[PDB]
Symmetry: C2
Amino acid sequence: SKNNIFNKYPTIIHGEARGENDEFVVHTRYPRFLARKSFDDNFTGEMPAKPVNGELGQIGEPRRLAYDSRLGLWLSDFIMLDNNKPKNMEDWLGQLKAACDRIAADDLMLNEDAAD
Amino acid sequence: SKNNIFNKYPTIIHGEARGENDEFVVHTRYPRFLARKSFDDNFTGEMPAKPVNGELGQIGEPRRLAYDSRLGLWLSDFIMLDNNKPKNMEDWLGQLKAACDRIAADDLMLNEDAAD
Ligand SMILES: [Mg+2]
Ligand SMILES: [Mg+2]
Ligand SMILES: [Mg+2]
Ligand SMILES: [Mg+2]
């Protein structure tokens, strides 16, 4: 089973590619995905008081699913690495938002790790 | 089609996770995969004269497919992100080795990018 091998990986993986300012992320637990992570020009990288609380919505033309952390970090171009079909859409959207919030928070931790 | 969305991503993505010394890679062209990338204790990070020329083999107990760059960099725990079944095994193994050699070479470029 491929899904089990994912479990050998750390839950959140932060990625980059040469020649690219945009970054990338892989989420290795359900719902598993690859996503692009981009940053507003005025992104600070300072952790907020309350936990991260972003929104998933359809944006741009054509409308594409995207995640706005509300802190300057975006996730887009999602690719689901599971082949199942989620029974409940509301549940699936919710589980995906919660994974994005953690990824966003995990990314803010990168900067504070480096200051230490 | 999921495969086409992969094409929006840069071919090779280099990853890390907090709390982990091992690193990660995602290859976004055929054959697409996620892999763990690890390093001998005496890894230098200096580019070689001739191109990278690693080997894929079965290693460890139980025997697992792994890639040895012969330069200190390893790839293991491969997860194929395509669901097809390769017609020819020799061809498939070969295409995978060639992707690993580029990934290894792309990783050596990370260090020389940073020196510049
Ligand atoms: Mg617009
Ligand atoms: Mg950052
Ligand atoms: Mg041994
Ligand atoms: Mg390195």
